[PDB]
């Protein structure tokens, strides 16, 4: 197992992780090497395929020209996994498009063939023991898993010996249920991975731990004091949203309803859905109509980013914020969602002033809605610092960069390479 911790039966939460010793805020509970992992397509050329090191002058794979490495050792070490995609990418060319889930699942199957025994990533929970929720799958979810299984056979039949379709549905379901997205310091998606021991942890909307990454290594650090006998909880989702939203996401992706202190008390729901203090106050049904509209625009924008232009996307943000502002306060989470999306579009367009303009409005409400140590808060401070620095506002930039560092020292560890990069940014000016 893992020192100072143990696997246990968490009543009404299946298996979980329990503390056997005290952990103070910022203490590393444990580390978990990725069992299987995949660098996202959009990050190729920016990060090493093998170790995820972000570097300039990465060496390109001579065959496919679509994998980049630190050196010949990272290249060689990645080959058992890279071979699943190397020649297929050149053969299928433009037609090579497996989803990230399929790419990761191919790697799980490849690892199971090479290393059938329990790995150092499975000290407490094994990939084979993962919860699948197979019994809870409706026709829509089974159809999505069937598309994934067809893509797996379509792109990965060369090296893989496939189990029956039934074993593949259980696998794809286990991957959806237990998979992690690996994010950088700005919470940008880097790739997807399996961290079996990290997946043993149950969810809470007031977690006592944060998961961070040192390349492909997951690190679990306390963000609240943990005492012997206490269960170790991480958040599976973005905690900005009110109770109903959070639980709709948890029911849809994880097949459970959270009953943590946040979900029970609903303490932050009032401020999260803050209403304007108008002379004629807005009616209850007028609030409910706007909450319904707000959730619909969030989904409309999600779809729109795949095909609409940056100006069309900013229009959706501006127009929706205008409609919402008649009922909702600027600190309201639905207003904040659109502002964050609009900031993201500005960043892409290299409109640094526009991105800064939005970030400035987001930061204070973020601090109030998110937990004490929050990667979402740290990430926003970091973006703001970098924008201020980029725009020659060095004193404001240094203040924001130091606010990012203060949170990151707890979540990532005082010695994290991300903090050394930020300090170099402060020092170089």
């Amino acid at each position: 197992g893992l020192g100072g911790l143990e696997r246990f039966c968490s009543p009404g939460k299946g298996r979980g992780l329990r503390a056997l010793q005290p952990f103070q805020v910022g203490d590393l509970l444990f580390s978990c090497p990725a069992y299987a992992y995949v660098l996202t397509v959009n990050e190729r050329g920016n990060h090493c395929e093998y170790c995820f090191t972000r570097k300039e002058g990465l060496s390109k794979c001579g065959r496919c020209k679509q994998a980049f490495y630190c050196n010949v050792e990272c290249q060689k070490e990645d080959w058992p996994m890279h071979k699943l995609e190397c020649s297929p990418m050149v053969v299928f060319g433009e037609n090579w498009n497996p989803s990230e889930t399929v790419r990761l699942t191919a790697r799980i199957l490849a690892k199971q063939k090479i290393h059938p025994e329990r790995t150092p990533s499975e000290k407490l929970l094994a990939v084979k023991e993962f919860e699948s929720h197979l019994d809870k799958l409706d026709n829509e979810k089974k159809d999505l898993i069937q598309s994934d299984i067809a893509a797996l056979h379509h792109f990965y039949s060369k090296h893989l010996e496939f189990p029956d379709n039934d074993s593949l549905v259980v696998l794809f379901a286990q991957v959806n249920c237990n998979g992690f997205t690996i994010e950088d310091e700005e919470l940008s998606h880097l790739g997807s991975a399996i961290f079996p021991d990290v997946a043993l942890m149950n969810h809470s909307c007031c977690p006592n731990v944060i998961v961070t990454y040192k390349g492909t290594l997951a690190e679990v650090r306390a963000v609240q004091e943990i005492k012997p006998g206490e269960e170790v909880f991480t958040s599976y989702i973005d905690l900005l949203y009110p109770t109903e939203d959070r639980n709709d996401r948890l029911r849809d992706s994880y097949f459970f309803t959270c009953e943590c202190q946040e979900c029970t008390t609903k303490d932050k729901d009032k401020a999260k859905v803050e209403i304007r203090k108008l002379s004629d106050p807005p009616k209850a049904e007028a609030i409910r109509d706007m909450v319904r509209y707000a959730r619909n625009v969030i989904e409309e924008f999600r779809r729109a980013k795949h095909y609409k232009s940056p100006s069309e996307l900013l229009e959706i943000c501006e127009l929706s914020q205008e409609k919402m502002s008649s009922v909702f306060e600027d600190s309201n989470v639905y207003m904040l969602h659109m502002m964050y999306q609009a900031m993201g579009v500005c960043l892409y367009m290299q409109d640094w002033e526009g991105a800064l303009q939005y970030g400035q409005k987001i930061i204070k409400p973020y601090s109030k809605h998110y937990p004490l140590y929050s990667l979402n808060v740290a990430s926003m401070w970091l973006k703001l610092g970098r924008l201020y620095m980029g725009l020659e506002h060095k004193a404001a930039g240094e203040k924001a960069l130091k606010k990012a560092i203060a949170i990151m020292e707890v979540a990532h560890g005082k010695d994290h390479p991300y903090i050394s990069e930020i300090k170099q940014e402060i020092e170089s000016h």
Binding site: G179, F180, T181, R249, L375
Partner: peptide, 6 residues
């Protein structure tokens, strides 16, 4: 997948 932002 299990992350801070979706």
């Amino acid at each position: 997948l299990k992350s801070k932002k979706g």
